[PDB]
Amino acid sequence: EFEERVVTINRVAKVVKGGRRFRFTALVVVGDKNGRVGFGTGKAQEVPEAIKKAVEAAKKDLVVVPRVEGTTPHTITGRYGSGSVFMKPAAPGTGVIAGGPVRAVLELAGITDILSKSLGSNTPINMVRATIDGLQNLKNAEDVAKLRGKTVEELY
Amino acid sequence: MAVISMKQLLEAGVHFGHQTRRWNPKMKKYIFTERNGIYIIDLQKTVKKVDEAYNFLKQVSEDGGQVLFVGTKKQAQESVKSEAERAGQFYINQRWLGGLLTNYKTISKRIKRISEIEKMEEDGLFEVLPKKEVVELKKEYDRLIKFLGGIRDMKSMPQALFVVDPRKERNAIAEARKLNIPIVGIVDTNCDPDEIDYVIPANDDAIRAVKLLTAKMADAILEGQQ
Amino acid sequence: GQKINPIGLRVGIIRDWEAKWYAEKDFASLLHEDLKIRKFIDNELKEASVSHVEIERAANRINIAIHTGKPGMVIGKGGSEIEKLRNKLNALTDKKVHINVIEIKKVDLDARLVAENIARQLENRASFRRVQKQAITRAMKLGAKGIKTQVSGRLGGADIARAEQYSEGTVPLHTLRADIDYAHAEADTTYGKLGVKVWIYR
RNA sequence: GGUGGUGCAUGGUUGUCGUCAGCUCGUGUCGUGAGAUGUUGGGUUAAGUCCCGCAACGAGCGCAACCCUUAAGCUUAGUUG
RNA sequence: CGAAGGCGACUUUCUGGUCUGUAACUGACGCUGAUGUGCGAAAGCGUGGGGAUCAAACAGGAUUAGAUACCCUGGUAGUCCACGCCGUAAACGAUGAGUGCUAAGUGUUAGGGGGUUUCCGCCCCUUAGUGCUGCAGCUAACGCAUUAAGCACUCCGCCUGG
RNA sequence: UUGGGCGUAAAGCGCGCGUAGGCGGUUUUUUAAGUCUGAUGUGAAAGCCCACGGCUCAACCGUGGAGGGUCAUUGGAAACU
């Protein structure tokens, strides 16, 4: 189930010699609670198509987040442009404490044991990019030991 | 069959690139030696890439794969169109219209617009129209099959891809790196091998590089169908 | 918008006559008797969403043809509400006899059918989007291509009038042999009037 | 009863720019966005009127006659003309 | 070419310094660079050649609706240079200085390298550079990308609302 | 510091040269100084780890080690300084 989360409504006014438009764009985050997470937007007007074309746009790319279960396996961060996020793994019995673009990809993957020091910008585009571009750069233990050519259980 | 064997390989012109500064710098695996600026393939890898692509076009057609073919440049208007009919596949003859594959729910309609305006002027009730419209009904007709005469019987999605050259069809492999289509082209130098899956660095003046490879390549989708 | 009435653009070019009678001689007296019965004819229908009327005069047989878009309330039960207009037909003037009635399926496909209706959906001033969004979206679901209907006179309660239209598609509204019907209503709101200019299509 | 006042409460409603020919939408694509492509380069024209070539295709409004008529014809009835 | 301000008919004097090539030798003898010392463009404080030309200030004629303004010259120091400086410029490549590494093409300045040769010219290796286009990376983008604002190290200095 | 910038936003004097200072190429051997460990003493009373006791709950006071795992008395190890 491609779990939806909206960010905002919008209005854009292109002042010309004539008249300005009433485009109502948006941007959403679409995860699945499995470690296969996307996000999407669209220059739309319809609040359904603000979801629908963007849910279609998020289903242009669901990124593969490797999840050693129970939390996010490492103490990680994010990076895009002028913004950057941060995640520290923690206990399960906490209650998730994060924000708007830093909680979004973190809650639609079912992990719930993390931190959030959302550094960088306040523009949610490159923020939720950094929430995604950091998270896509995650790696597990078993594939890297395959990639390095050691064994999996040799790493502790 | 599988290879261009070593007699008609060094005597035909399938061991040629062209000069530096019309050069792609990541063709170093496809550079053998300089022949007055013209480089040579290592003529075993270009087969071992393409003989497994021959098996890849075989097993993709074993699941019914319509391996898309493109011949668009003025060397390929009678190279890949002359080979895909010997290969039984769906060619492409004219240029990238701007959403034939990424927006394939509006520009694949031009095949439907050439399957409906044919159906308009095939049967009855075509006569009552003003005759100035039939000028541009037919001007719509010729332009529609100058481009998509290959995709006429292709009312399905393209599963794999064959381009002629990404120097003047760089947007083809851009589509093949956007919609995840496996692509194989007989490129020349100053063409990027990174976005393409099976590169053959062929000089673009040998139709024998087309006639001994690309008809027989999707002959492995006519025989690879079964 | 400094333009002219589009319903005037096809009088006798595309449309037919709603006045197809012949009154040449002594036109003055037997015209005032048409509009002396006419000024009560509309008020008794009680916003019936009438389309239009087609009067006919033939050897003093001035026959009334009112549409009354909602039926039933003009018939009664086999000539009980029809005789009352027939009784007033003999009461205002001498004969005026034999009133009729019609009805309309696809209840919002005519021009004045919507125009009398969407005026009456603006006294309450409740969901001027969704009632018209029920109207226009179902109109193309009732067979329409481009329908253009506006909400003009002083919406919301404001002291300034704000027009609010809804239109799309292909709309050849100026061609000579196309039947275009267009309307106007006077739904006041005790500060300003709703002159509504409707457009529909097929 | 108001021509007593108030276009500026307003319905309208016309004239103007103005023969001015320009004006809008859906799917692509590209942009972090503010936003751009379909109306354009070559040749041909009275005006989104052409064809080639163009990242475009689809959808339009006005767009010419269509309506009335000049004149150039045929056909009808010869009617008081 | 000069660190920079800069450097222009030349012949000569005294030289600086650049650079290549062979690389012989000492065995890192280095970089920043607070202090300090210099240069320090133009104008200004003054002298002697200066008032030939130019020219602040001043003058004249009219235009223009408006003057002596845009037009014009005459003309004062200041100009030119030498003799004292002052210590200021968009002195900006708006990029402090020294070292490693990552796509190219393209001319050009000096030295070494040649193949043919040329009747002194064609092609090509290299060094140091002078330039022009142009990946990955970069930034907010411009634009940079071997004459980095890319990827690393060392030092000084500076900055944190107007 | 962890965890900021100096081309156009605020961040290179006009450039230098240079005194101090800081920081410096490459490859071997000594110390154990700096590094990092191990035997203890071992760091403060309300404040400070963990668990009880006293408070009607509690507000508010003691207990038991933890105990320093940082400092000293002590042994050492040389790549790197």
CB B225 within 8 A of CB B216: no
The spacing between the Cα labelled CA in A6 and the C1' in E49, in angstroms, equals 88
Distance CA B50, CA B213 (A): 9
Of all nucleotides in the shown strands, which has a C1' nearest the CA of A15? D34
Q: What is the resolution of this structure in A?
A: 2.4
- C-alpha to C-alpha distance for C96 and C99, rounded to whole angstroms: 8
- Interrupted backbone of chain A, residues before each interruption (C–N > 2.5 Å): none
Identify the CA nearest to C36 among candidates C90, C98, C74, C93.
C93
What Å distances lie between residue C118 and B69, B217, C104, C195, CA to CA? Answer: 57, 66, 17, 11
Q: What distances in angstroms separate CA B20 from CA A8, B24, B25, B190, one per listed residue?
A: 52, 8, 9, 9
DSSP secondary structure code for residue C156 in this structure = T
Radius of gyration, alpha carbons of chain A: 18
Query: Which letter does DSSP use for residue A108 in this model?
Result: S
| CA–CA separation, B127 and B133 (whole Å) | 11
Tokens 């990174």 belong to B194
Q: How far is the CA of A82 from the C1' of E89 (A)?
A: 37
User: Cα–Cα distance between C48 and C183 in angstroms, integer?
Assistant: 15
Q: Who touches strand E, with Cβ under 7 Å?
A: A 81-82; B 20-21, 23, 25
Neighbors of chain B by Cβ distance (3+ pairs < 8 Å): none
Structure tokens at B11: 């005597």
Look-up: residue for tokens 């019309």? B22
Tokens in use for C37?
A: 């019965």
Nearest one of A45, A41, A49 to A21, comparing CA atoms? A45
Helices (H), C94-175: 111-120, 130-140
Distance A130 CA to D36 C1' (A): 27
Nearest nucleotide, C1' to the C-alpha of C176? D66
Q: Which nucleotide is nearest to B23 (CA to C1')?
A: E104
Subunits with at least 3 CB pairs below 8 A relative to chain A? none
Neighbour tally for C19: CB within 10 Å: 12
B197 φψ region: left (φ > 0), alpha (ψ -120 to 50), beta (else): alpha
Tell me, in Å, how far CA of A4 is from C1' of E140?
A: 31
Instruction: Tell how strand A76-77 and strand A86-87 pair up.
Output: antiparallel
Q: Which neighbouring-strand residues pair with C193?
A: C188
Phi, psi of A86 (to 5 degrees): -150, 140
C7 vs C48: CA distance, rounded Å = 21
Determined by cryo-EM
Task: Round to a whole number and report the distance in Å from the CA of C145 to the C1' of E45.
Answer: 91
B113-137 in b/e burial notation, b at 16+ Cβ within 10 A? bbeebeeeeeeeeeeeeeeeeeeee
Spanning CA of B190 to C1' of E128, the rounded length in angstroms is 32
CA pair distance C181, A34, nearest whole angstrom: 59
Structure tokens given for B90: 């769906």
Going by C-alpha positions, the residue among B84, B86, B48 that lies closest to residue B67 is: B84
Whether B173 and B185 have beta carbons less than 8 Å apart is answered as yes
**A88 CA vs F68 C1’ separation (Å):** 29
Which residue has its C-alpha nearest to nucleotide E140's C1'?
Answer: A82
CA distances, C66 to each of B189, B202, C7, C102 (Å)? 82, 83, 20, 8
Enumerate the nucleotides of strand D whose atoms come under 7 Å of any protein CB: 9-17, 23-36, 51-52, 54-67
Q: Which nucleotide is nearest to C159 (CA to C1')?
A: D9
Q: Helix or strand or coil: residue A103? A: coil
- Protein chain C, residues 121-160, with a C-beta closer than 7 Å to any atom of nucleic acid strand D: 152-154, 159-160
